[PDB]
Amino acid sequence: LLKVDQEVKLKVDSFRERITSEAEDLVANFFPKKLLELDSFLKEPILNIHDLTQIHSDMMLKSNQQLVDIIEKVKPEIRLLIEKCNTVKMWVQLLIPRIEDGNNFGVSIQEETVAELRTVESEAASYLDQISRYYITRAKLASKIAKYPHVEDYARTVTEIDEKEYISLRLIISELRNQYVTLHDMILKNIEKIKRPR
Amino acid sequence: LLKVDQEVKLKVDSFRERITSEAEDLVANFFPKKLLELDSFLKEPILNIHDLTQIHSDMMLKSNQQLVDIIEKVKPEIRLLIEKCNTVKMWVQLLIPRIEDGNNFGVSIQEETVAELRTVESEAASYLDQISRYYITRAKLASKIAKYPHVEDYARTVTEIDEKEYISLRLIISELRNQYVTLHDMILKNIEKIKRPR
Amino acid sequence: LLKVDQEVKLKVDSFRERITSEAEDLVANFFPKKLLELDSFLKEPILNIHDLTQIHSDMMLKSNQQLVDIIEKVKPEIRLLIEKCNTVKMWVQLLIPRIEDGNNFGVSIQEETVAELRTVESEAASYLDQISRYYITRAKLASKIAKYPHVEDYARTVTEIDEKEYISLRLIISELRNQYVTLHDMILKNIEKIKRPR
Amino acid sequence: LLKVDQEVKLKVDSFRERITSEAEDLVANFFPKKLLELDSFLKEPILNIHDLTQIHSDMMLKSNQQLVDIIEKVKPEIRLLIEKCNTVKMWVQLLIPRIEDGNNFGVSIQEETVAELRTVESEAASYLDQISRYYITRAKLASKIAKYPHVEDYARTVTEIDEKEYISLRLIISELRNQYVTLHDMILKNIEKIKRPR
Amino acid sequence: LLKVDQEVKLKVDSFRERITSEAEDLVANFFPKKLLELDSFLKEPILNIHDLTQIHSDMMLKSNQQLVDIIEKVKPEIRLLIEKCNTVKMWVQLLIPRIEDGNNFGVSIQEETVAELRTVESEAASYLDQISRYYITRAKLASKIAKYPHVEDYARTVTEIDEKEYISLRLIISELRNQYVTLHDMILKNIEKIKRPR
Amino acid sequence: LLKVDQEVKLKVDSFRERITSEAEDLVANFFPKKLLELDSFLKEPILNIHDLTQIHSDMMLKSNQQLVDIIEKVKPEIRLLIEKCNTVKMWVQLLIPRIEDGNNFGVSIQEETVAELRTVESEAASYLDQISRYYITRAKLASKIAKYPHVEDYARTVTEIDEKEYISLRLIISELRNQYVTLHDMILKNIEKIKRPR
Amino acid sequence: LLKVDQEVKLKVDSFRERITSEAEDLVANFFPKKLLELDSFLKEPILNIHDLTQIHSDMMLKSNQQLVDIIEKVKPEIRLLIEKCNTVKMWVQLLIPRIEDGNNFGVSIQEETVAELRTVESEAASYLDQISRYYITRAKLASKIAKYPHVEDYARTVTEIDEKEYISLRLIISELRNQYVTLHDMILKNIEKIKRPR
């Protein structure tokens, strides 16, 4: 064993408690409330447009406002899952016990929970990257529309990128709603083994 | 266990019921009706042209309107599988039980069902990317036909891309019809274990 | 179980029978007739040229018309295998039974058959891509022959690409004939287990 | 055995003791104090800005100074984990015993600890690379904003990169804090087998 | 079972007999004679030049005649192995029996034989690609010797590529000779199980 | 067995004895002396600069002298480990016995030791590549600072590369010291089985 | 079995005997003599220069003669290992017996010997590619030194590539010597099972 100073140890123990209280309130209060808010956004008219010709913008020059406005609403939700998933993962990580030869089935559930939260955080970060990739790809296609006015397929590439972003951003909002419901159910179904592994 | 507020819990239970009702009607009613519509599209003349020299457009400048018209009908069908597959996957996920050492054969069927729905949803998204890649590739080749008028293989590259897109778009419509029938049969054959795993 | 409307169910059952009837005739009557036609093409003089200096075109400018003429014959055959393999794969997929703990040896033969048909369909689609890559690569090499008239190796690169495409297109016709005979023998040597898995 | 000079052996033993002393203080005193400092930074206002439009710089030309100031604070903390993790890994490596057929469960804990410390050191080095990629990518986008003033998406690409860097730097400060608490708990829980494997 | 037309079946059986006769004569007569011809080429002076400075061409402009002449002899031999290996692979493939739970050791030898022939046919096709890559790389290096006359290393890159091609082409003639002897020995040693698997 | 000429055998035996003597002195006397020298360099002021803004050079034009001076000291130490690790690997490789069915636990230690030395020798060679990548990356960024004088992120990219190189070169010196102590401990602990495997 | 013509069979048997005699003389006379010649080269002054600033050439324009002179000696030695390893691999391949269910331990030693010789022959071919990459990389860096005279790091990149090539060429000469001694010991230690597997 290595000796640890008591005054710092008491401050570390208060951090471990605060992380425990937040992770439990996030799983049992925030994850359920956030699922209801994200479900309500998907029932709004902006995210349910049948003719995708409506979302098209005339074009080099301007950026799609109908997409810029939806992205501005989606980006705050992706940032909240990444932050809240990190607090929940740390809580499960600090409940994993001393490595021992037997009674390691509960530890596997705790290790499976930490691996799911790492997948959710990585998928959420990819969604933020896809929004940046849309702006760079539309920006390049706009430069090519001006450089080669004769080719009509350059213009069709901008309309295709805009329509695919509308489908992709609506799918990201459905996936964020699905991740909050899936993580709440799994953590609550497997709570006794996650809280008390052995 | 972590305590959950009852009023928000009652709202979460209504979401879980709505997702169950929709997923059951999509597998039982929509998936079979969509298979009949996609099979009817494949017997229409626009998708059954023996001489692919009739799909050719003279060319920089214009974009094939025989292909732009088919892509316009294919893209709405690809978007419906991605959205409907996501609702059915969530229904199976919310049925997966507390992790336990034994009686996990039914859980495997529920986990195999979610893995197939993820493969179907990823393949459908790839089909939408392929339509965008056609427009960028034809656009680049159209720019080269103008830059190098002398090379006659630049023109043959545009005729080849148009013929490969026609064969590819008909294969996407047949694959989308195959995914609706294959997913209906598997979910209906394996329903008792998916609904009641243990 | 989920209830299914009877009138649509009768229509789904009629589709399942048509896919069964077509798939049985393709394995039994079309795969054997197509092997005999593809074998006869390989004995025609155009696909059996010993001196490969006779398939050479003088060159920027023109595209080989000895190669363009063979590609025009090879491309329709690659398209027929992709469409017919898709109908046979679906017939086998609709015969795979409810997942159960035992008696899964026949299911493995049905799953192994679907995996072979997926490999044949992917290899056939790759062959269509190889023909498009020939045109883009020859087109670029032709642009370089005009940009750098001094380098003698740019011209040798065009003669090499034309000779390799002749060897490659003849290998594709042999591989397509081999896939028809191989799929016919495996499907009718393993029919009893594929039709009746358990 | 190979004979080793005693005077150099005495000096190697003092190095081996100094590394043991430092690693034990780093795990029991520094790792806990650093978690407390990194948690306090996350509660400071600079890292808690709700409207991410307040971190936007007007733009070619100038670099974000709200981001340059945070990177100047984040980069020293990443450098301390990489150096301190290397001292702790060497201590665990020098406790691994002579390879023997049995009683190798504790050696697995020591080998698992060295693998976690190698993962922490690699992840920390990646975070330093991500800060360099932000500057090169913003520099390139700034050059394109000057080259193509007409395209409005080039400007949106810079605001998007600045907002993603703010979210990423707050995540690096949280991950660095999480690595100090995770490594302190694992090494202290598993100390008896890490110090005395057999 | 599926019924097959007798007249088309009789023609399919004649094809299977012709493939069997050719594959048996290729393994027993052609593979041994080809190994003797390829061994005789390797003892000729053209492929046994000690001073590799003698195979150098002065250079943009001219391509190496000494190497163009050897590639002209090597390329026909690579084409014969690819075509003849395809006939031998099909004969072994048409001998693989109905899938059964036991007595599957001979089937493994037949499957190992088809996998080796697929490796030989793929390695041979790569050798044809390597010859095309030499011409494109020498062409690019020749364009750079003219663009940057001052840099002496551009000239040394052409002499190095020519010497490496001489070594590579002699290794390809030895590998083609080694594939003929290796495939003859394995197929004759393992014939009883390949011809009669069970 | 194959007969070997005695006079050449006696000379081969003298080589194997000389390699054995060197490998034993290198593990017993040089690995320990080199670890003390590399540890002393890490306590020197040049490798321990807290303000990393003191290692910054004004900038196209000049290269960082503070970094050039350290790379000149680091590169000789990386070269000595690569050369000495090769003599120690050959000594262990030439002690591996005739392949036999049993008593292969000691051979595994000898095979595991040769694999660690291959990892050290490959990692050390990578460090020499990283020093070359610094010069090419700083050189490209310096070309861009002159081409695009307006963008201030190009200048921040050079200061960042210089700071990451200082952190990296101090990490290479600590890793080289750690490899000498780790290799000496493992080879000396596992000596009886490495020298006499069975 | 397939009948084989006796006269061609007698000629194949003489080829098989010639490969056996050559392979046994290479393992027992050439491999030992080549290890001694390559060890003597490593003790010559040209490959043992302490100050690597003495191998530097002033520079666009000239190529390093001190390196062109060492590469001219190293390249003939890499070529001999590739050709001689191919003769030894074929001898071991032609001794591998008919596949049988049991008594397959010796076949594993013969299969391990063919795999080692394939790794040695692939590594040697890569060393020849590395000599070509030095020339193309030095040539490109020399072109950039003339294009951007202001950037001093372009010049430091040529001095670094030259010093790394000197270290790499001495490492290739030691690796070629190590491969001759390692292959002689493994083949002579494991000869009885390689010559008579069962």
JSON list of C-alpha atoms in Angstrom, two decimals, chain E residues 3-139:
[
{"chain": "E", "resi": 3, "resn": "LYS", "atom": "CA", "xyz": [-35.67, -30.85, -62.74]},
{"chain": "E", "resi": 4, "resn": "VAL", "atom": "CA", "xyz": [-33.04, -30.15, -65.50]},
{"chain": "E", "resi": 5, "resn": "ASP", "atom": "CA", "xyz": [-33.67, -30.53, -69.31]},
{"chain": "E", "resi": 6, "resn": "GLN", "atom": "CA", "xyz": [-31.88, -33.68, -70.63]},
{"chain": "E", "resi": 7, "resn": "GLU", "atom": "CA", "xyz": [-30.48, -32.22, -73.91]},
{"chain": "E", "resi": 8, "resn": "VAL", "atom": "CA", "xyz": [-28.92, -29.21, -72.11]},
{"chain": "E", "resi": 9, "resn": "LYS", "atom": "CA", "xyz": [-27.78, -31.62, -69.34]},
{"chain": "E", "resi": 10, "resn": "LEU", "atom": "CA", "xyz": [-25.98, -33.86, -71.89]},
{"chain": "E", "resi": 11, "resn": "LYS", "atom": "CA", "xyz": [-24.14, -30.77, -73.26]},
{"chain": "E", "resi": 12, "resn": "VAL", "atom": "CA", "xyz": [-23.23, -29.68, -69.69]},
{"chain": "E", "resi": 13, "resn": "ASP", "atom": "CA", "xyz": [-21.79, -33.22, -69.04]},
{"chain": "E", "resi": 14, "resn": "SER", "atom": "CA", "xyz": [-19.65, -32.99, -72.21]},
{"chain": "E", "resi": 15, "resn": "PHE", "atom": "CA", "xyz": [-18.25, -29.64, -70.91]},
{"chain": "E", "resi": 16, "resn": "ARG", "atom": "CA", "xyz": [-17.42, -31.23, -67.53]},
{"chain": "E", "resi": 17, "resn": "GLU", "atom": "CA", "xyz": [-15.64, -34.11, -69.31]},
{"chain": "E", "resi": 18, "resn": "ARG", "atom": "CA", "xyz": [-13.60, -31.66, -71.50]},
{"chain": "E", "resi": 19, "resn": "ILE", "atom": "CA", "xyz": [-12.55, -29.58, -68.44]},
{"chain": "E", "resi": 20, "resn": "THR", "atom": "CA", "xyz": [-11.52, -32.83, -66.63]},
{"chain": "E", "resi": 21, "resn": "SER", "atom": "CA", "xyz": [-9.39, -34.06, -69.58]},
{"chain": "E", "resi": 22, "resn": "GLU", "atom": "CA", "xyz": [-7.67, -30.68, -70.06]},
{"chain": "E", "resi": 23, "resn": "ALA", "atom": "CA", "xyz": [-7.02, -30.19, -66.32]},
{"chain": "E", "resi": 24, "resn": "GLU", "atom": "CA", "xyz": [-5.52, -33.70, -66.05]},
{"chain": "E", "resi": 25, "resn": "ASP", "atom": "CA", "xyz": [-3.30, -33.16, -69.18]},
{"chain": "E", "resi": 26, "resn": "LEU", "atom": "CA", "xyz": [-2.23, -29.69, -67.94]},
{"chain": "E", "resi": 27, "resn": "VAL", "atom": "CA", "xyz": [-1.15, -31.09, -64.53]},
{"chain": "E", "resi": 28, "resn": "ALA", "atom": "CA", "xyz": [0.54, -34.23, -65.95]},
{"chain": "E", "resi": 29, "resn": "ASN", "atom": "CA", "xyz": [1.99, -32.97, -69.30]},
{"chain": "E", "resi": 30, "resn": "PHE", "atom": "CA", "xyz": [1.98, -29.11, -69.65]},
{"chain": "E", "resi": 31, "resn": "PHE", "atom": "CA", "xyz": [3.11, -28.17, -66.09]},
{"chain": "E", "resi": 32, "resn": "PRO", "atom": "CA", "xyz": [6.20, -30.46, -66.34]},
{"chain": "E", "resi": 33, "resn": "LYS", "atom": "CA", "xyz": [7.16, -29.28, -69.90]},
{"chain": "E", "resi": 34, "resn": "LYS", "atom": "CA", "xyz": [6.65, -25.57, -68.97]},
{"chain": "E", "resi": 35, "resn": "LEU", "atom": "CA", "xyz": [8.96, -25.96, -65.90]},
{"chain": "E", "resi": 36, "resn": "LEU", "atom": "CA", "xyz": [11.70, -27.32, -68.21]},
{"chain": "E", "resi": 37, "resn": "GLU", "atom": "CA", "xyz": [11.27, -24.34, -70.66]},
{"chain": "E", "resi": 38, "resn": "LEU", "atom": "CA", "xyz": [11.28, -21.69, -67.88]},
{"chain": "E", "resi": 39, "resn": "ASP", "atom": "CA", "xyz": [14.39, -23.32, -66.27]},
{"chain": "E", "resi": 40, "resn": "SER", "atom": "CA", "xyz": [16.17, -23.19, -69.69]},
{"chain": "E", "resi": 41, "resn": "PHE", "atom": "CA", "xyz": [15.36, -19.42, -70.04]},
{"chain": "E", "resi": 42, "resn": "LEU", "atom": "CA", "xyz": [16.96, -18.75, -66.62]},
{"chain": "E", "resi": 43, "resn": "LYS", "atom": "CA", "xyz": [20.28, -20.32, -67.84]},
{"chain": "E", "resi": 44, "resn": "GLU", "atom": "CA", "xyz": [20.34, -18.00, -70.91]},
{"chain": "E", "resi": 45, "resn": "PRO", "atom": "CA", "xyz": [22.82, -15.04, -70.86]},
{"chain": "E", "resi": 46, "resn": "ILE", "atom": "CA", "xyz": [20.07, -12.31, -71.12]},
{"chain": "E", "resi": 47, "resn": "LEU", "atom": "CA", "xyz": [18.79, -13.17, -67.59]},
{"chain": "E", "resi": 48, "resn": "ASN", "atom": "CA", "xyz": [22.29, -13.75, -66.10]},
{"chain": "E", "resi": 49, "resn": "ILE", "atom": "CA", "xyz": [24.10, -10.36, -66.33]},
{"chain": "E", "resi": 50, "resn": "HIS", "atom": "CA", "xyz": [26.45, -9.84, -63.31]},
{"chain": "E", "resi": 51, "resn": "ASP", "atom": "CA", "xyz": [27.21, -6.13, -63.94]},
{"chain": "E", "resi": 52, "resn": "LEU", "atom": "CA", "xyz": [23.80, -4.47, -63.73]},
{"chain": "E", "resi": 53, "resn": "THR", "atom": "CA", "xyz": [25.43, -1.28, -65.12]},
{"chain": "E", "resi": 54, "resn": "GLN", "atom": "CA", "xyz": [25.27, -3.03, -68.55]},
{"chain": "E", "resi": 55, "resn": "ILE", "atom": "CA", "xyz": [21.44, -2.94, -68.61]},
{"chain": "E", "resi": 56, "resn": "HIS", "atom": "CA", "xyz": [21.44, 0.90, -68.30]},
{"chain": "E", "resi": 57, "resn": "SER", "atom": "CA", "xyz": [19.97, 3.27, -70.96]},
{"chain": "E", "resi": 58, "resn": "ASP", "atom": "CA", "xyz": [21.16, 6.91, -71.39]},
{"chain": "E", "resi": 59, "resn": "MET", "atom": "CA", "xyz": [18.40, 9.48, -70.61]},
{"chain": "E", "resi": 60, "resn": "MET", "atom": "CA", "xyz": [13.41, 12.19, -70.83]},
{"chain": "E", "resi": 61, "resn": "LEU", "atom": "CA", "xyz": [13.21, 10.41, -74.19]},
{"chain": "E", "resi": 62, "resn": "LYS", "atom": "CA", "xyz": [14.14, 6.71, -74.72]},
{"chain": "E", "resi": 63, "resn": "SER", "atom": "CA", "xyz": [12.79, 3.63, -72.86]},
{"chain": "E", "resi": 64, "resn": "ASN", "atom": "CA", "xyz": [15.20, 0.73, -72.04]},
{"chain": "E", "resi": 65, "resn": "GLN", "atom": "CA", "xyz": [15.26, -1.73, -75.00]},
{"chain": "E", "resi": 66, "resn": "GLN", "atom": "CA", "xyz": [17.12, -4.35, -72.94]},
{"chain": "E", "resi": 67, "resn": "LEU", "atom": "CA", "xyz": [14.21, -4.44, -70.49]},
{"chain": "E", "resi": 68, "resn": "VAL", "atom": "CA", "xyz": [11.41, -3.96, -73.11]},
{"chain": "E", "resi": 69, "resn": "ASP", "atom": "CA", "xyz": [12.79, -7.13, -74.78]},
{"chain": "E", "resi": 70, "resn": "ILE", "atom": "CA", "xyz": [12.77, -9.25, -71.54]},
{"chain": "E", "resi": 71, "resn": "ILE", "atom": "CA", "xyz": [9.25, -7.96, -70.55]},
{"chain": "E", "resi": 72, "resn": "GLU", "atom": "CA", "xyz": [8.11, -9.02, -74.02]},
{"chain": "E", "resi": 73, "resn": "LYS", "atom": "CA", "xyz": [9.30, -12.62, -73.22]},
{"chain": "E", "resi": 74, "resn": "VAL", "atom": "CA", "xyz": [8.07, -12.61, -69.54]},
{"chain": "E", "resi": 75, "resn": "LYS", "atom": "CA", "xyz": [4.52, -11.23, -70.20]},
{"chain": "E", "resi": 76, "resn": "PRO", "atom": "CA", "xyz": [3.36, -14.20, -72.39]},
{"chain": "E", "resi": 77, "resn": "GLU", "atom": "CA", "xyz": [4.42, -16.79, -69.67]},
{"chain": "E", "resi": 78, "resn": "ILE", "atom": "CA", "xyz": [2.43, -14.93, -66.94]},
{"chain": "E", "resi": 79, "resn": "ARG", "atom": "CA", "xyz": [-0.67, -15.05, -69.22]},
{"chain": "E", "resi": 80, "resn": "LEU", "atom": "CA", "xyz": [-0.37, -18.85, -69.78]},
{"chain": "E", "resi": 81, "resn": "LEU", "atom": "CA", "xyz": [-0.24, -19.65, -66.00]},
{"chain": "E", "resi": 82, "resn": "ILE", "atom": "CA", "xyz": [-3.30, -17.45, -65.30]},
{"chain": "E", "resi": 83, "resn": "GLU", "atom": "CA", "xyz": [-5.40, -19.17, -68.03]},
{"chain": "E", "resi": 84, "resn": "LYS", "atom": "CA", "xyz": [-4.19, -22.78, -67.36]},
{"chain": "E", "resi": 85, "resn": "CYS", "atom": "CA", "xyz": [-4.55, -22.41, -63.53]},
{"chain": "E", "resi": 86, "resn": "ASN", "atom": "CA", "xyz": [-8.22, -21.35, -64.06]},
{"chain": "E", "resi": 87, "resn": "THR", "atom": "CA", "xyz": [-8.93, -24.66, -65.94]},
{"chain": "E", "resi": 88, "resn": "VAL", "atom": "CA", "xyz": [-7.24, -26.74, -63.14]},
{"chain": "E", "resi": 89, "resn": "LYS", "atom": "CA", "xyz": [-9.14, -24.83, -60.36]},
{"chain": "E", "resi": 90, "resn": "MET", "atom": "CA", "xyz": [-12.52, -25.47, -62.04]},
{"chain": "E", "resi": 91, "resn": "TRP", "atom": "CA", "xyz": [-11.83, -29.22, -62.35]},
{"chain": "E", "resi": 92, "resn": "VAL", "atom": "CA", "xyz": [-11.07, -29.44, -58.57]},
{"chain": "E", "resi": 93, "resn": "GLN", "atom": "CA", "xyz": [-14.15, -27.24, -57.78]},
{"chain": "E", "resi": 94, "resn": "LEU", "atom": "CA", "xyz": [-16.50, -29.53, -59.77]},
{"chain": "E", "resi": 95, "resn": "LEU", "atom": "CA", "xyz": [-15.24, -32.54, -57.70]},
{"chain": "E", "resi": 96, "resn": "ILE", "atom": "CA", "xyz": [-16.21, -31.04, -54.27]},
{"chain": "E", "resi": 97, "resn": "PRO", "atom": "CA", "xyz": [-19.12, -33.14, -52.81]},
{"chain": "E", "resi": 98, "resn": "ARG", "atom": "CA", "xyz": [-22.53, -32.48, -51.09]},
{"chain": "E", "resi": 99, "resn": "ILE", "atom": "CA", "xyz": [-21.83, -30.84, -47.68]},
{"chain": "E", "resi": 100, "resn": "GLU", "atom": "CA", "xyz": [-22.10, -33.53, -44.93]},
{"chain": "E", "resi": 101, "resn": "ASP", "atom": "CA", "xyz": [-21.20, -33.51, -41.19]},
{"chain": "E", "resi": 102, "resn": "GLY", "atom": "CA", "xyz": [-18.43, -36.19, -41.36]},
{"chain": "E", "resi": 103, "resn": "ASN", "atom": "CA", "xyz": [-15.81, -37.62, -43.80]},
{"chain": "E", "resi": 104, "resn": "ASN", "atom": "CA", "xyz": [-14.82, -34.02, -44.61]},
{"chain": "E", "resi": 105, "resn": "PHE", "atom": "CA", "xyz": [-10.98, -34.48, -44.52]},
{"chain": "E", "resi": 106, "resn": "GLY", "atom": "CA", "xyz": [-10.66, -35.13, -48.30]},
{"chain": "E", "resi": 107, "resn": "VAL", "atom": "CA", "xyz": [-12.96, -32.15, -49.00]},
{"chain": "E", "resi": 108, "resn": "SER", "atom": "CA", "xyz": [-10.45, -30.04, -47.03]},
{"chain": "E", "resi": 109, "resn": "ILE", "atom": "CA", "xyz": [-7.61, -31.19, -49.38]},
{"chain": "E", "resi": 110, "resn": "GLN", "atom": "CA", "xyz": [-9.83, -30.20, -52.37]},
{"chain": "E", "resi": 111, "resn": "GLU", "atom": "CA", "xyz": [-10.55, -26.82, -50.71]},
{"chain": "E", "resi": 112, "resn": "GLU", "atom": "CA", "xyz": [-6.79, -26.31, -49.92]},
{"chain": "E", "resi": 113, "resn": "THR", "atom": "CA", "xyz": [-6.01, -27.12, -53.64]},
{"chain": "E", "resi": 114, "resn": "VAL", "atom": "CA", "xyz": [-8.59, -24.51, -54.89]},
{"chain": "E", "resi": 115, "resn": "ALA", "atom": "CA", "xyz": [-7.19, -21.93, -52.42]},
{"chain": "E", "resi": 116, "resn": "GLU", "atom": "CA", "xyz": [-3.56, -22.47, -53.59]},
{"chain": "E", "resi": 117, "resn": "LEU", "atom": "CA", "xyz": [-4.61, -22.20, -57.27]},
{"chain": "E", "resi": 118, "resn": "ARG", "atom": "CA", "xyz": [-6.46, -18.93, -56.44]},
{"chain": "E", "resi": 119, "resn": "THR", "atom": "CA", "xyz": [-3.22, -17.63, -54.74]},
{"chain": "E", "resi": 120, "resn": "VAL", "atom": "CA", "xyz": [-1.10, -18.66, -57.80]},
{"chain": "E", "resi": 121, "resn": "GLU", "atom": "CA", "xyz": [-3.60, -17.00, -60.21]},
{"chain": "E", "resi": 122, "resn": "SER", "atom": "CA", "xyz": [-3.67, -13.79, -58.06]},
{"chain": "E", "resi": 123, "resn": "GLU", "atom": "CA", "xyz": [0.17, -13.60, -57.65]},
{"chain": "E", "resi": 124, "resn": "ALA", "atom": "CA", "xyz": [0.54, -14.06, -61.42]},
{"chain": "E", "resi": 125, "resn": "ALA", "atom": "CA", "xyz": [-1.94, -11.23, -62.14]},
{"chain": "E", "resi": 126, "resn": "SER", "atom": "CA", "xyz": [0.02, -8.95, -59.74]},
{"chain": "E", "resi": 127, "resn": "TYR", "atom": "CA", "xyz": [3.22, -9.65, -61.78]},
{"chain": "E", "resi": 128, "resn": "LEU", "atom": "CA", "xyz": [1.47, -8.23, -64.89]},
{"chain": "E", "resi": 129, "resn": "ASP", "atom": "CA", "xyz": [0.52, -5.11, -62.81]},
{"chain": "E", "resi": 130, "resn": "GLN", "atom": "CA", "xyz": [4.16, -4.68, -61.69]},
{"chain": "E", "resi": 131, "resn": "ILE", "atom": "CA", "xyz": [5.27, -4.48, -65.37]},
{"chain": "E", "resi": 132, "resn": "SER", "atom": "CA", "xyz": [2.70, -1.67, -66.03]},
{"chain": "E", "resi": 133, "resn": "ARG", "atom": "CA", "xyz": [3.80, 0.14, -62.82]},
{"chain": "E", "resi": 134, "resn": "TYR", "atom": "CA", "xyz": [7.42, 0.17, -64.07]},
{"chain": "E", "resi": 135, "resn": "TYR", "atom": "CA", "xyz": [6.41, 1.98, -67.27]},
{"chain": "E", "resi": 136, "resn": "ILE", "atom": "CA", "xyz": [4.28, 4.64, -65.42]},
{"chain": "E", "resi": 137, "resn": "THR", "atom": "CA", "xyz": [7.00, 5.24, -62.77]},
{"chain": "E", "resi": 138, "resn": "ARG", "atom": "CA", "xyz": [9.85, 5.44, -65.36]},
{"chain": "E", "resi": 139, "resn": "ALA", "atom": "CA", "xyz": [7.62, 7.83, -67.38]}
]
